[PDB]
Amino acid sequence: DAYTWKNVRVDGGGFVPGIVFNRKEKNLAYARTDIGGAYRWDQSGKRWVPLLDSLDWDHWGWTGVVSLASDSVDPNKVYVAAGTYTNSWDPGNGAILRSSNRGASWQSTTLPFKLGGNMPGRGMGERLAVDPNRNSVLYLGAPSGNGLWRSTDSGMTWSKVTSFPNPGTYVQDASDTSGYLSDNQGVVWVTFDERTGSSGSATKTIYVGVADKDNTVYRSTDAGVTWSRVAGQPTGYLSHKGVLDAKDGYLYLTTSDKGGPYDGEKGQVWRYTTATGEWKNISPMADADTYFGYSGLTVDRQKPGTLMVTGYSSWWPDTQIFRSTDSGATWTRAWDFTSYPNRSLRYTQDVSSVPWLTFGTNPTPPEVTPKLGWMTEALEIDPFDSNRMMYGTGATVYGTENLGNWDTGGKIAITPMIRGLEETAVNDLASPPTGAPLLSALGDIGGFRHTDLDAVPARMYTSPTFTTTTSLDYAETNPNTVVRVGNNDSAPRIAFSTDNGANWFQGSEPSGVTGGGTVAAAADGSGFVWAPEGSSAVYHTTGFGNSWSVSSGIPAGAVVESDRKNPKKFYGFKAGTFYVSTDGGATFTARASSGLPADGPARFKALPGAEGDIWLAGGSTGGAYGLWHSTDSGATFTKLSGVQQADTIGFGKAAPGASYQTLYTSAKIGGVRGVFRSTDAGASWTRINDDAHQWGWTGASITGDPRVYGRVYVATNGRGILRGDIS
Numbered sequence: 001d002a003y004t005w006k007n008v009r010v011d012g013g014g015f016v017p018g019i020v021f022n023r024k025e026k027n028l029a030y031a032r033t034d035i036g037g038a039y040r041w042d043q044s045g046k047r048w049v050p051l052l053d054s055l056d057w058d059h060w061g062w063t064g065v066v067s068l069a070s071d072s073v074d075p076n077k078v079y080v081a082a083g084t085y086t087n088s089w090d091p092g093n094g095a096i097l098r099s100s101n102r103g104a105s106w107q108s109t110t111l112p113f114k115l116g117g118n119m120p121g122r123g124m125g126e127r128l129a130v131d132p133n134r135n136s137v138l139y140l141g142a143p144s145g146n147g148l149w150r151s152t153d154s155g156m157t158w159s160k161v162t163s164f165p166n167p168g169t170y171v172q173d174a175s176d177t178s179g180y181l182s183d184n185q186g187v188v189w190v191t192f193d194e195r196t197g198s199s200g201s202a203t204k205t206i207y208v209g210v211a212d213k214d215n216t217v218y219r220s221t222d223a224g225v226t227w228s229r230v231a232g233q234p235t236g237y238l239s240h241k242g243v244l245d246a247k248d249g250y251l252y253l254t255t256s257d258k259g260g261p262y263d264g265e266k267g268q269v270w271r272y273t274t275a276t277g278e279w280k281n282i283s284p285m286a287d288a289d290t291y292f293g294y295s296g297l298t299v300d301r302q303k304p305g306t307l308m309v310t311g312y313s314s315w316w317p318d319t320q321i322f323r324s325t326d327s328g329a330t331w332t333r334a335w336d337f338t339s340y341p342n343r344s345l346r347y348t349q350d351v352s353s354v355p356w357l358t359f360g361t362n363p364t365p366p367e368v369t370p371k372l373g374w375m376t377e378a379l380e381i382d383p384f385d386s387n388r389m390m391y392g393t394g395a396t397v398y399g400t401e402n403l404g405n406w407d408t409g410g411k412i413a414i415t416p417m418i419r420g421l422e423e424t425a426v427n428d429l430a431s432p433p434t435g436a437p438l439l440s441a442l443g444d445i446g447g448f449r450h451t452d453l454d455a456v457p458a459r460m461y462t463s464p465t466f467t468t469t470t471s472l473d474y475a476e477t478n479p480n481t482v483v484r485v486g487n488n489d490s491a492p493r494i495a496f497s498t499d500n501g502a503n504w505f506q507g508s509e510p511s512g513v514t515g516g517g518t519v520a521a522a523a524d525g526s527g528f529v530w531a532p533e534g535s536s537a538v539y540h541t542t543g544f545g546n547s548w549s550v551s552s553g554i555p556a557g558a559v560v561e562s563d564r565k566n567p568k569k570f571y572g573f574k575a576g577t578f579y580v581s582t583d584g585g586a587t588f589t590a591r592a593s594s595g596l597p598a599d600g601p602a603r604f605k606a607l608p609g610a611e612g613d614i615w616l617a618g619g620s621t622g623g624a625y626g627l628w629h630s631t632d633s634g635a636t637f638t639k640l641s642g643v644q645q646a647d648t649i650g651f652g653k654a655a656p657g658a659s660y661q662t663l664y665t666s667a668k669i670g671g672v673r674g675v676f677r678s679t680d681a682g683a684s685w686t687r688i689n690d691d692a693h694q695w696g697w698t699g700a701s702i703t704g705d706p707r708v709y710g711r712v713y714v715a716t717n718g719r720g721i722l723r724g725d726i727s
């Protein structure tokens, strides 16, 4: 069987830090994400096309894209700087990935240091740049003290620019012992002045942005041999972007007192006249009235004099977008306070195509839902259409096709431009045997009852809303009964449904909960077992969580699951020990542990229709790793000898003429990392994905479909919910 892969339709759901239009070819554009690769625009379908799905389990870190560059001399060429963390969370050095067919296939060169696609500062840029006159020359701004790097053979080999004098100084929080907030944000954008080269000869003037409040912009005038700070530059702020209007000879800088993308409490906008050296402060608001940093910097290539910026970190009442048609001499805004706190709008916004973007809230005026945006580091005017612009938020990409209405005193029309760009971190998936085909547990946007896998759901889970759902379950014998738990600053962190997840209601909470953990539903829907994060025990309830008691004999934070057939049977796993209860979760006892994985994560599930039939996947290179099977309710497990490592396990409808339900697993088998299917209860396996469809780390969740043979739902970490079917 050949397989066809598509997303379950959600559209967006995470941060898009950068958008890039090609300057040579109309309608050529890309987007970069921090954990989910990169995308090419499809103008015909008004949708985004993922380009980095080939990156495998062992190269998951390359799915973080800190910068992207699209060659103006040869628009077939595109380059990405790949790598996710510079601390111990990402074991792999970063890389430059190069393609000569607009992202259809890639080659890599590994750098001798790590890159920061999901680090602080990731909305500054673009820090990877191609010479617009001799396009075999590239530059890369590097983090952590590594400075400025260069290639002169179209990105195949890289070496340090030793003559660059300042590797950056800025650190968000030096005290963070995890290394996440404590890295030097380094060299953050690179911009050529294309007027200073000619075809085949290196561009002589190069501007470089540095995360150093005392020296945020450097220049070379001799094609990168020597460097100097730009004289008279403003100090006290970090330049998130540097953009050059070459027709008028203006270099623009949007600066902030923080690195972003979340923080930023002051900032400025400056204009540097390249011919004379003059600096002008063109900030849209007075400093006393500024409570955010600036970024979102873009010039209209077809109408020099026109530019826009954002107050990227304005959290209330909304983000702010600013526009000038006179090179920063005067500005107008997407909205204005009239009689404080009431507001005037210069735009309308229609999210009927992605209805869940209201987040189910009812905010107090002057706030509205959906918001104009937030975290708007990326804002771009189409170089070939003055009436189109796109910008990124923490949840979506918004755009307009009548931007000129702004200049004639009308209102611009904003809509999501996000279809195909699937960014969610998926924690858990369920495909019950009746009702909707899928229920999702997602970071940041909660999750959905998917009534139609090919349509965006109307609304995330509400009443209560969860920031993130960590685990969900349903009653095997009545899938109208559903439970979920998740993360929230305050109670409630558990919710139930009696109508298959269409409408919810909260429960009460046991002691000390700080987050979702895992949850399990009795097979008949009569009660539940909750292993929350933070709390000092596991708890069980009869009915909908009105009264909780401690589950004795199982440790806090175990993974909990329910038997599918015996309502009184529940299971737990933690740290190499399997736990069983036969009284609804009131008491557990330690059963098997012999040979079960003691180190690393695990996933396990009981089989629909079979009491005591349990499959468990997990472990790590620190100890045992693989797939185990018990048919005696966890008294003994057998390790499957031909599965070298495994991380997830799930089930779907039996094959025609098969004794047993079909198994699906994210695993390593016969030396190959991939997604595998068995129709003979794990005696043999067939790989059902392929080297173009890998999606990095898929260790969170997998399930088949009880009603559709062959179908598999694969959780990803930043590419949404992937759906495979037999072709």
Ligand SMILES: OC[C@H]1O[C@@H](O[C@H]2[C@@H](OC[C@H]3O[C@@H](O[C@H]4[C@H](O)[C@@H](O)[C@H](O[C@H]5[C@H](O)[C@@H](O)[C@H](O)O[C@@H]5CO)O[C@@H]4CO[C@H]4OC[C@@H](O)[C@H](O)[C@H]4O[C@@H]4O[C@H](CO)[C@H](O)[C@H](O)[C@H]4O)[C@H](O)[C@@H](O)[C@@H]3O[C@@H]3O[C@H](CO[C@H]4OC[C@@H](O)[C@H](O)[C@H]4O)[C@@H](O)[C@H](O)[C@H]3O)OC[C@@H](O)[C@@H]2O)[C@H](O)[C@@H](O)[C@H]1O
Pocket (backbone or CB within 6 Å): 013, 014, 015, 034, 035, 060, 088, 089, 090, 091, 118, 119, 178, 394, 424, 425, 443, 444, 601, 697, 699, 717, 718
């Ligand atoms: O994915 C979580 C999952 O990871 C499992 O490990 C996998 C995995 O690990 C990589 C790394 O992931 C971190 O979490 C990421 C998350 O994966 C992303 O989805 C998420 O993205 C955002 C994105 O940033 C937004 O821009 C976008 O809009 O939405 C998405 C989705 O929300 O980011 C988080 C990290 O968040 C921080 O960075 C991004 C910032 O935006 C964000 O503000 C910031 O959050 C702060 O986070 C810190 C975190 O400590 C804190 O909560 C602050 O309060 C908060 O504000 C994990 O954080 C990180 O640990 C993962 O690294 C690996 O950790 C493994 C386990 O380590 C522990 O156990 C072993 C022990 O030795 C260690 O000491 C101990 O820490 C470790 O084994 C592994 O080696 C590390 O790589 O992907 C690769 C795979 O190999 C890993 O197995 C993990 O097992 C599981 O439990 C779960 O956490």
Ligand SMILES: OC[C@H]1O[C@@H](O)[C@H](O)[C@@H](O)[C@@H]1O[C@@H]1O[C@H](CO[C@H]2OC[C@@H](O)[C@H](O)[C@H]2O)[C@@H](O[C@@H]2O[C@H](CO[C@H]3OC[C@@H](O)[C@H](O)[C@H]3O)[C@@H](O[C@@H]3O[C@H](CO[C@H]4OC[C@@H](O)[C@H](O)[C@H]4O)[C@@H](O)[C@H](O)[C@H]3O)[C@H](O)[C@H]2O)[C@H](O)[C@H]1O
Pocket (backbone or CB within 6 Å): 013, 014, 015, 262, 315, 316, 358, 359, 361, 371, 374, 393, 394, 395, 444
């Ligand atoms: O009503 C209060 C309101 O007015 C003023 O009083 C106050 O000054 C304002 O701050 C406040 O606005 C609210 O501000 C907070 C930000 O808060 C702090 O930063 C500024 C400081 O002055 C202040 O002291 C701090 O407390 C916003 O919270 C953030 O919310 C967004 C998501 O909310 C948005 O999405 C839902 C929609 O309904 C909202 O309209 C919209 O604003 C979060 O963004 C998401 O974050 C995750 C990653 O998160 C994790 O990492 C960051 C960490 O802060 C967080 O705790 C972790 O969970 C990304 O994956 C998503 O891509 C991204 O969308 C911010 O994390 C969160 O800080 C309030 O939204 C705002 O109302």
Ligand SMILES: [Cl-]
Pocket (backbone or CB within 6 Å): none
């Ligand atoms: Cl269509």
Ligand SMILES: [Cl-]
Pocket (backbone or CB within 6 Å): 402
């Ligand atoms: Cl119109």
Ligand SMILES: [Cl-]
Pocket (backbone or CB within 6 Å): 601, 602
């Ligand atoms: Cl985990």
